[PDB]
């Protein structure tokens, strides 16, 4: 299989900006390349076929170029409609293969997460398991590290993370890491930290109960 590699994996920009995405094939593919756009929830849409040809409908700020192994898609002045994920797909050789995507997101001015922790509700613990939820609210950029600490001991391998898409107002994110344990394993206990590291934080803010 031809391997297609997109750069960058993620990109932050603003209305008006000229943007360039790239795609490198592990061998010459003779411009047999398609660029796709996919908004979340929705299906792909072909933007560019055979390296340089626009699909019908596709606004003209979009353009592709390249030869041999290297191709770029270029948006000359970004529109609010243009924040999505972009893929190159190759049809020079069998089978067609896809790049892993370049997500094109909105740039805004940092702003730090507000943290909130919640102990398990009392009905839960009656039944087998204890579920403790930490929340990080309205932050930017997407990068954020969430570390639980039970009696100040770092634990691994029993929490699940989950992030929202970019809010339609804030252009920020929100995060939900839940730590789950049986009621028996749950009672050591009560000092239960949610240590979070982030770029807009001077220092790892911690919430406990």
């Amino acid at each position: 299989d031809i391997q297609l590699t997109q750069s960058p994996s993620s990109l932050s920009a603003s209305v008006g900006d000229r943007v360039t995405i790239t795609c490198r094939a592990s061998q010459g593919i003779s411009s047999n390349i398609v660029w796709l756009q996919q908004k979340p929830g929705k299906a792909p849409k072909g933007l560019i076929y055979h390296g340089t040809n626009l699909e019908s409908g596709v606004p003209s700020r979009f353009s592709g170029s390249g030869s041999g192994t290297d191709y770029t898609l270029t948006i000359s002045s970004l529109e609010p409609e243009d924040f999505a994920t972009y893929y190159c797909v190759q049809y020079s050789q069998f089978p067609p293969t896809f790049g892993q995507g370049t997500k094109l997101e909105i740039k805004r001015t940092v702003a730090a997460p507000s943290v909130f922790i919640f102990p398990p509700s009392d009905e839960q613990l009656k039944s087998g398991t204890a579920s403790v939820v930490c929340l990080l609210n309205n932050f930017y950029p997407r990068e954020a590290k969430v570390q639980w600490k039970v009696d100040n001991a770092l634990q691994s391998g029993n929490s699940q993370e989950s992030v929202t898409e970019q809010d339609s107002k804030d252009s920020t994110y929100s995060l939900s890491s839940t730590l789950t344990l049986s009621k028996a394993d749950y009672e050591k206990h009560k000092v239960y930290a949610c240590e979070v590291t982030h770029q807009g934080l001077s220092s790892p803010v911690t919430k406990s109960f």
């Binding site: 792909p44 922790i117 009905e123 929340l135 992030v163």
Partner: protein, 221 residues
Amino acid sequence: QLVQSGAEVVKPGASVKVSCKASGYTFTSYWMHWVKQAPGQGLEWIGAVSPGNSDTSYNEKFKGKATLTVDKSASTAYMELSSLRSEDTAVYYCTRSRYGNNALDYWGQGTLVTVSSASTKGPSVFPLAPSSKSTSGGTAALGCLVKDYFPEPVTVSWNSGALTSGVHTFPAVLQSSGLYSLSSVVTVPSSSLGTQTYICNVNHKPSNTKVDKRVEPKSCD
């Protein structure tokens, strides 16, 4: 355009037939393609079929897992996924190419195929209670943990429309046990945390489970 059949929840060893109705173009001028998209391998090409003489081409990775056919009459392509496993859980797309020419321009809206041993279960909405403190002045946050339901989706609203703001109803997550968890959250002013009544309006159509649940400070250790 390209309209496909609806989502499908099915159990392991089973098999599914997905459909794609082309309309508004000459069905027989295009090869119809099938594409898998799932977190894990990303976008993968399953194979394609030529509607005229039903010629096929399959990705070795999907060779045998899938069988493509066509109905020229109904301008429709079919994909049949057999000997199903939970790894085949994905969204499956149809798309087209023109021998000239273009592309992979038009795609179907996709068909979600979920494969799980797990059988239908309703949620278990648990309250994420607002703590006594503090935080950095205002404000305060609370929510509902919609734990252990099958399968997706669940719809969580708050005060049924009276709270379309500050709300974050997270994406699900598949736990071991093969069961989904979800957590919704709203941020409310630090002051009125005992003046307004917040009830989770979770409903989960896959069974008839509509749950209300309110959230308050509890006042114990």
